[PDB]
Enzyme design. Structure first.
Site, short mmCIF file in Angstrom:
data_model
loop_
_atom_site.label_atom_id
_atom_site.label_comp_id
_atom_site.label_asym_id
_atom_site.label_seq_id
_atom_site.Cartn_x
_atom_site.Cartn_y
_atom_site.Cartn_z
N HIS A 94 10.21 -1.72 7.80
CA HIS A 94 10.22 -1.95 9.25
C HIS A 94 11.65 -2.02 9.82
CE1 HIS A 94 9.97 -6.44 8.37
NE2 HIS A 94 11.01 -6.40 9.21
N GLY A 141 15.30 -12.29 11.48
CA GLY A 141 16.46 -11.92 10.68
C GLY A 141 16.29 -12.19 9.19
N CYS A 175 13.85 -11.19 7.27
CA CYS A 175 13.17 -10.11 6.57
C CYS A 175 14.05 -9.52 5.49
CB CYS A 175 12.65 -9.05 7.53
SG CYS A 175 11.58 -9.70 8.84
O1 LIG Z 1 7.55 -10.89 11.94
C1 LIG Z 1 8.63 -10.31 11.99
C2 LIG Z 1 8.80 -9.01 12.74
C3 LIG Z 1 7.66 -8.07 12.43
C4 LIG Z 1 6.63 -7.87 13.34
C5 LIG Z 1 5.46 -7.22 12.97
C6 LIG Z 1 5.32 -6.74 11.67
C7 LIG Z 1 6.37 -6.89 10.79
CL1 LIG Z 1 6.24 -6.22 9.19
C8 LIG Z 1 7.53 -7.54 11.15
N1 LIG Z 1 9.75 -10.79 11.42
N2 LIG Z 1 9.78 -12.10 10.96
C9 LIG Z 1 9.51 -12.53 9.70
N3 LIG Z 1 9.55 -13.84 9.59
C10 LIG Z 1 9.85 -14.30 10.88
C11 LIG Z 1 9.85 -15.60 11.37
C12 LIG Z 1 10.03 -15.79 12.74
C13 LIG Z 1 10.19 -14.71 13.60
C14 LIG Z 1 10.19 -13.40 13.12
C15 LIG Z 1 10.02 -13.23 11.75
#
Ligand SMILES: O=C(Cc1cccc(Cl)c1)Nn1cnc2ccccc21
Ligand SMILES: O=C(Cc1cccc(Cl)c1)Nn1cnc2ccccc21
Lengths: 304, 304
Positions: B41, B143, B145
């Site tokens: 992603h 951030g 990820c």
């Molecule tokens: O969730 C996402 C972005 C995203 C959206 C949809 C699908 C996917 Cl694969 C990724 N990133 N993310 C990971 N842990 C987090 C915690 C707090 C905020 C954002 C955070």
């Protein structure tokens, strides 16, 4: 979101862990520059620990009696000295992995990460708080002596704790990196008791702010209180008296959530008087006091 | 004595953390040998995440569009490929800090350490369990990820998890190091719910053994039960059914304490039916399920 008892990344500290042997005793040492720091009880036998005369015991020891091993290579000891309850072994080689470091004496209620070690090898890392009675509720076994506690500020490691002993009550006692014990403890196999331990009120409040930030708001109420009324309740429940400095330090969390500190105090007051009624806060069924307001801000903002 | 949610020392993993940027998105990558692994992603924008066609999106990208930074030095990207939900960026330089490593897909109920990172920099380490519903209750922000989960066996790092997303419920989802999600989750900004989460029964039992080992014995009773009677209670309380394999794995703890597994089950049965009555076990007011029998043995024996 989410909230965990998070420890600092321990890499900079693992690179400093060494094995220190003297006679038949083996413990952990901290190698920074050309100096190895370890508990002075390394020079004792099981018989000596009853009532040791460390000056007399150290006198029967020479540089060659202290064996310092870093990984699988031997360090040459060229000097030895006792500073309070730590031995400082001067080695001929400076640690190439020495990070930027400071020695600091933390205050009760402050937190730090512990890298538990055995035979100079790290086995685990956990976050701890220095209790108001100067003990730490750690996880240590025989051989863990010399394991250190620390905080990290970007690239600088602030060493604050060195593990020395487990009290008969199961709690842990140790020193700062100058060998001064936290608390009234002495490095001797004699029954020693820690004082009454209180709950770190400012930390419970900071954790209630983390809970609000993470969506757990059930405990928030339509009430408020004063510093004086709150502290009457804090004394009844063996909670540290809340001062205006604690309120000041809670300022960033109060501003982030829009919940005034005294309003959060009123929520804590009702939690203390009524219990949790079988509910949880941030996955815990009790009030957590091992996160300072700085830890909550750091964890909830992403300070690397 | 003492019992903490202990994470593995994270040094070997910090030496592998890199920053990966693609377009305007920045996340963490794992640099092992001449390959950098990160969530796919990274190639998406906020608009693409609604319903991304990753094959089509990756096609508009070249080796030069992926910026990999290790500390403050830039890595040259000579190859790129998508394997399930991870991007594998071939770099011209092998990581000099690559530890001995394996890629493993852990089972639900197993535990692992997480090194949470932002901009390729580690900020904290905590111990987690893969929930039976394949989510993890971590502590992550935007951030994070590309942050990885791992276990360490003496010198070998077994990478088991890479963080990809936070579900609207606050829980976390991610993949193994081959890019296969744990659970039914897809890397798309669409409402996805995890299944019903159950309590890891074998882990609660292992933690009850740690409590006995550490002096907390109040919950021990004069009763016993059978696997069938116990599982009737486990189903009522959304606890994973206990199998003979779980009993077998509890064998070392049963032998250490002299308390038969079914006797410990009877204690757990009464804890489930009667609650804790305001008491605590190992400093917790609820039944802890995030320590496997291996973690309890390791922590209570000192495996470095
Ligand atoms: O969730 C996402 C972005 C995203 C959206 C949809 C699908 C996917 Cl694969 C990724 N990133 N993310 C990971 N842990 C987090 C915690 C707090 C905020 C954002 C955070
Ligand atoms: O307590 C000691 C030995 C000792 C005895 C008397 C005084 C002093 Cl300074 C040291 N070591 N130690 C530290 N944490 C431990 C945990 C479990 C068993 C032993 C452990």
């Amino acid at each position: 979101s989410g909230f965990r008892k998070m420890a600092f990344p321990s890499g900079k500290v693992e690179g400093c862990m060494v094995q220190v042997t003297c006679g038949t005793t083996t413990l952990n040492g901290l190698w920074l520059d050309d100096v190895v720091y370890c508990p002075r009880h390394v020079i004792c036998t099981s018989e000596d620990m009853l009532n040791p005369n460390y000056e007399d015991l150290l006198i029967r020891k020479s540089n060659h009696n202290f064996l310092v091993q870093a990984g699988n290579v031997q360090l040459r000891v060229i000097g030895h000295s006792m500073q309070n309850c730590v031995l400082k072994l001067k080695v001929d080689t400076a640690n190439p992995k020495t990070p930027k470091y400071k020695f600091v004496r933390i205050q009760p209620g402050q937190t730090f990460s512990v890298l538990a070690c055995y035979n100079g090898s790290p086995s685990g890392v956990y976050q701890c708080a220095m209790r108001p009675n100067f003990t730490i509720k750690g996880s240590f076994l025989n051989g863990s002596c010399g394991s250190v506690g620390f905080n990290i500020d970007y690239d600088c490691v602030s060493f604050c704790y060195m593990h020395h002993m487990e009290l008969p009550t199961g709690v842990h006692a140790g020193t700062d990196l100058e060998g001064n014990f936290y608390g009234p403890f002495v490095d001797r196999q004699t029954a020693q008791a820690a004082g009454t331990d209180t709950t770190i009120t400012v930390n419970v409040l900071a954790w209630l702010y983390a809970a609000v930030i993470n969506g757990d708001r059930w405990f928030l109420n339509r009430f408020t209180t004063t510093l004086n009324d709150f502290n009457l309740v804090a004394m009844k429940y063996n909670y540290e008296p809340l001062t205006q400095d604690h309120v000041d330090i809670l300022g960033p969390l109060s501003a982030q959530t829009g919940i005034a500190v005294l309003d959060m105090c009123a929520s804590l007051k009702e939690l203390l008087q009524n219990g949790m009624n079988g509910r949880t806060i941030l996955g815990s069924a009790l009030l957590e006091d091992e996160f300072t307001p700085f830890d909550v801000v750091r964890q909830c903002s992403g300070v690397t």
